[PDB]
């Protein structure tokens, strides 16, 4: 599948993922593509801050779903 | 006022009700329509809301299920997952066709979500569907 990631400034980037991979692994895909380290990555989706333990299937994330990437200053 | 096409369709839904479907416009909003509609869904009444966006007839009507149904093409929030309203809509279709197409889905649940278990385990899953139509659609 493909997901989006929008940042604080407004930039949106596409990313390939699967519905069964964990956010910890999803946080890695955003790293290999954008360099942001999973340490300062805070991914938000629809008013919910994602927890590294759960998986995308638990959050009902489908194709075209957009994530919001917020970093720690 | 409101476009003539909507007026014409309203008078046809009033002067020619569809078999087994009650559809009436809200007194306050003319574009809002209250809709009530063998299979395990026999007996339980199912309420529905239908809306006509300003882009109508270009854009497809908005229809969801106020009542809770156990169905592969209806999610937890009642939005109807039918192609006629998704991307196969054309201005030629009308409210009449949408309603008729929805009741068709009731008759033929297509597993082609919960559908993973509703299609594989067709016996254990349908046992729950028949109940929901009595628990959540009592009257």
């Amino acid at each position: 599948m493909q997901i989006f990631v929008k940042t604080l400034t407004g930039k949106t980037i596409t990313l390939e993922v699967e519905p069964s991979d964990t956010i910890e692994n999803v946080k890695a895909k955003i790293q290999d593509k954008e360099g942001i380290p999973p340490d300062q990555q805070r991914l938000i989706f629809a008013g919910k801050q994602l927890e590294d333990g759960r998986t995308l299937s638990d959050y009902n994330i489908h194709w075209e779903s957009t994530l919001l990437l917020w970093w720690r200053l | 006022g409101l476009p003539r096409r909507i007026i014409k369709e309203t008078q046809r839904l009033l002067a020619e009700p569809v078999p087994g479907i009650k559809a009436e416009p809200d007194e306050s909003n003319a574009r809002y329509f209250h809709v009530v509609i063998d299979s395990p869904f026999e007996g339980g009444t199912f309420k529905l809301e239908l809306f006509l966006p300003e882009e109508y007839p270009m854009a497809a009507p908005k229809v969801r299920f106020m009542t809770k149904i156990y169905h592969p093409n209806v999610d937890k929030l009642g939005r109807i997952c039918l192609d006629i309203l998704k991307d196969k809509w054309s201005p030629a279709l009308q409210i009449r066709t949408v309603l008729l197409s929805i009741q068709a889905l009731l008759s033929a649940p297509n597993p082609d979500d919960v559908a993973e278990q509703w299609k594989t385990n067709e016996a254990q899953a349908i046992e729950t569907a028949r109940a929901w139509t009595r628990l959540y659609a009592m009257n």
Binding site: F4, K6, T7, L8, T9, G10, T12, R42, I44, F45, A46, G47, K48, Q49, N60, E64, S65, T66, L67, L68, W70, W71, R72, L73 | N29, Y32, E49, F51, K62, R64, M66, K68, K76, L77, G78, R79
Partner: protein, 136 residues
């Protein structure tokens, strides 16, 4: 029609519409009345709020979007219009709620709350330790 608008606002929250500085979604994915929502805001640059994440609970009543919704912070924050004891937002203190129009939405309320965090009064104001949540 209340239900269908909240359905559009749900899909927009899933597509992350806006400048990426606010987010909203259902508190319970099985809630068929679409009443209780959760919002989140990230502080604006050049303010004491900047980069602090704030969560909010939002309640859309039966007359939504005719009337404004209820809004309260769950994360502690010191800001004019927000009750210092439970984080409830006073609609009289927020122009977007004081003069509510049915064109507005949850997104607008969040965007308005973030913009107001740049106001002179709120720009510089002692904040509690980050991440604290009111007693609920």
């Amino acid at each position: 029609p209340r239900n269908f608008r909240l359905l559009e606002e749900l899909e927009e929250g899933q597509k992350g519409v806006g400048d990426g500085t606010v987010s909203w979604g259902l508190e319970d994915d099985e809630d068929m009345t679409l009443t209780r929502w959760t919002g989140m805001i990230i502080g604006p640059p050049r303010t004491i709020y900047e980069n602090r994440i704030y969560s909010l609970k939002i309640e859309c009543g039966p007359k939504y979007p005719e009337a404004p919704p209820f809004v309260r912070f769950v994360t502690k924050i010191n800001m004019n219009g927000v009750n210092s004891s439970n984080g409830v937002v006073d609609p009289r203190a927020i122009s977007v709620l004081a003069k509510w129009q049915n064109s507005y939405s949850i997104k607008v309320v969040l965007q308005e709350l973030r913009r107001l965090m740049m106001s002179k009064e709120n720009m510089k104001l002692p904040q509690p330790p980050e991440g604290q949540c009111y007693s609920n």
